[PDB]
């Protein structure tokens, strides 16, 4: 698994691959890795799967309780911070959860990273998961905050693409959303290897 996200002039696009591998074996290879919490929240997943599914779904339960109580559509700070508390409670209990909370709040596009330990980071460019570093390399050399949505999308497909090309634990299809001002919209769920042949010729 390799999962990245960056933000620019026109919002935040989060791209995730779609293979889930039990050790050396490929359990399923069209997994959906990006749990959609609200109409305009977005949290990815990585590491041991059940931790991301349970704790991030539960995160959606907290956000829904908030939105019913205060009626004011919980922000990204409270989201990543609250999931940060769910993780920080079970410190060192073995939870392997590396995830990211994308969204759009009153202050603007808030991109956060929430680690199994309790690490919590705003930022411009992230890339988690077993093949994160490759996505770093192919994102940076080819990142600039004046990218239009098209060049952004192609940049994501290049990032997750080569990230699953050199990696063993990553592949399948690439999901890539576009967290715009009025909420996310799924930009593509593209095959990977076909991309790599479109990029090798």
């Amino acid at each position: 698994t390799t999962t990245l996200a960056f933000k620019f002039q026109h919002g935040v696009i989060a791209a995730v691959d779609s293979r889930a591998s039990a050790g050396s074996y490929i359990s399923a290879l069209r997994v959906n890795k990006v749990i959609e919490i609200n109409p305009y929240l977005l949290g990815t997943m990585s590491g041991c799967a059940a931790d991301c599914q349970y704790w991030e779904r539960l995160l959606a339960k907290e956000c829904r309780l908030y939105y019913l109580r205060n009626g004011e559509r919980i922000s990204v700070s409270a989201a990543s911070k609250l999931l940060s508390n769910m993780m920080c409670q079970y410190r060192g209990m073995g939870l392997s959860m590396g995830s990211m909370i994308c969204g759009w709040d009153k202050k603007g596009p808030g991109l956060y990273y929430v680690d199994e330990h309790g690490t919590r980071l705003s930022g411009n460019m992230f890339s988690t998961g077993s093949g994160n570093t490759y996505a770093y390399g192919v994102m940076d050399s080819g990142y600039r905050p004046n990218l239009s949505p098209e060049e952004a999308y192609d940049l994501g497909r290049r990032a997750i693409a080569y990230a699953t090309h050199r990696d063993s634990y990553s592949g399948g299809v690439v999901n890539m959303y576009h967290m715009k001002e009025d909420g996310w919209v799924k930009v593509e769920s593209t095959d990977v290897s076909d991309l790599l042949h479109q990029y090798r010729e």
């Binding site: 993780m87 920080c88 680690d115 309790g118 690490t119 980071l121 994160n132």
Partner: protein, 196 residues
């Protein structure tokens, strides 16, 4: 890794830290801030195992702010340092061993500035200057070579850039930009981040 540093002159405390929050090979963030504004005149500098830093030090921040809202005044830096010392010691043997190394730099209107050290075993020790991380092993002897009790804050910054230039030359970890704040009777002054 993470490198704090603090110097305490006549009437201030010039603390500096690194701005990297890594994950095992890659700098995930180069604009992270390791100095947590306790109150108008108290900075808290926390480094170490992730999760312990933010959780613990924000706990201390909230207790201090609570004190000020309960009694209309702030903890004198001796009191804050011995307080965080209490929580870290009482949590040293508890269910949750927080592995944080601190420096709670402060300036009181009365007693003057003081720079409290704290290893992760809750050992408190006032010092005229300190450090943490492996970079301490390459800078503290430099501070010893150049420190003087009457050092002026400009000379302080010059010294501090000698230490940090030493890290950029010799220390093994990519530490590109450093936060640097000063504390005097007028409060906190977010000075210019040192880069290389």
């Amino acid at each position: 890794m993470e490198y704090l540093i603090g110097i305490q002159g006549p009437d201030y405390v010039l603390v500096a830290s690194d701005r990297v929050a890594a994950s095992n090979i890659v700098q995930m963030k180069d604009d992270h801030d390791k100095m947590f504004k306790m109150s108008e005149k108290i900075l808290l500098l926390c480094v170490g195992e992730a999760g312990d830093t933010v959780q613990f030090a924000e706990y201390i921040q909230k207790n201090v702010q609570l004190y000020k809202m309960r009694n209309g005044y702030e903890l004198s830096p001796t009191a804050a340092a011995n307080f965080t010392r209490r929580n870290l010691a009482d949590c040293l043997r508890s269910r949750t061993p927080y592995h944080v190394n601190l420096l709670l730099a402060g300036y009181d209107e009365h007693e003057g500035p003081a720079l409290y050290y704290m290893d992760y075993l809750a050992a408190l020790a006032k010092a005229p200057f300190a450090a943490h991380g492996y970079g301490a092993f390459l800078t503290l002897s430099i501070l010893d070579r150049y420190y003087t009790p009457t050092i002026s804050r400009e000379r302080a910054v010059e010294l501090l850039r000698k230490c940090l230039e030493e890290l950029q030359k010799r220390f093994i970890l990519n530490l590109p930009t450093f936060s640097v704040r000063i504390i005097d009777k007028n409060g906190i002054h977010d000075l210019d981040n040192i880069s290389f």
